[PDB]
Design a protein around this ligand. Structure first.
Ligand SMILES: [Mn+2]
Ligand SMILES: [Mn+2]
Ligand SMILES: [Mn+2]
Ligand SMILES: [Mn+2]
Ligand SMILES: [Mn+2]
Ligand SMILES: [Mn+2]
Ligand SMILES: [Mn+2]
Ligand SMILES: [Mn+2]
Lengths: 115, 116
DNA sequence: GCGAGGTGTAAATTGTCTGACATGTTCT
DNA sequence: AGAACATGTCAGACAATTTACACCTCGC
């Protein structure tokens, strides 16, 4: 199930999954993205173990780009985890019509920004 | 006070509490129960209440007294901004193309349908 | 070759929960 | 009063990161 995976994870690793749901990336690129989110330096000694653990849970694929660089991407299971937490979040945020119109505005602005 | 400064370091558990309260304010054990539905297993109240207290001191949750054994927890304005800021983050990374988006659109549509 | 890029890794510190015991309250 | 309801609290146990050192690789 997507849920039994999406629960459990630490905030740090669900943020890793969100980042990878935008695009597959190599390790230090994930690192910089998380530094922009947290507004703090992110220790690589924290990130690599956590990507490793997301791999043994089958939510992240670790392929080789260089002999010094790895690319990390979402497996179909990690994607289902992302979607499941997004569904839970929206299920509880869209509690009335103004909440829906708010989400619709966010999504429409995002879409427009894809340009 | 920016919720981004206070809510991006929260634990997953605390974020889920904010999510639950985003739907509507609830008393303690009602939060416990809805969390238990999300997690599929029991949530120890000795874990819940101290994290509600931490969210309260961070200015994201308000603790009122319904009766003198029961407390009602509810988002402050900053707690609502924390929920919205996290949702905007998740979305800005998820809405990567037209199909990801229409997926979100149908999710929201079904949610609005459940409210009738 | 040399420096910078990319990742691996773990002991000690720090962060958090578990698994309780516990006190007042509302109900019948 | 008896019993479930609601929350308070925390020490022992567990989960996590910090802060280093470390090894190989690509770029110039
Ligand atoms: Mn940075
Ligand atoms: Mn680093
Ligand atoms: Mn829209
Ligand atoms: Mn976060
Ligand atoms: Mn917590
Ligand atoms: Mn309990
Ligand atoms: Mn945010
Ligand atoms: Mn936005």
């Amino acid at each position: 199930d997507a849920r039994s995976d999406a629960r459990d994870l630490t905030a740090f690793q669900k943020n890793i999954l969100t980042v990878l749901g935008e695009e597959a990336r190599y390790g230090l690129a994930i690192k910089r993205e998380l530094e922009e989110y947290y507004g703090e330096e992110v220790n690589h000694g924290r990130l690599y173990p956590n990507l490793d653990d997301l791999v043994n849970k089958g939510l992240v694929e670790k392929s080789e780009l260089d002999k010094r660089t790895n690319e990390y991407a979402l497996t179909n299971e990690g994607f289902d985890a992302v979607v499941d937490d997004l569904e839970w979040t929206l299920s509880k945020f869209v509690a009335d019509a103004d909440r829906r119109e708010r989400v619709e505005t966010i999504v429409a602005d995002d879409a427009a920004a894809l340009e």
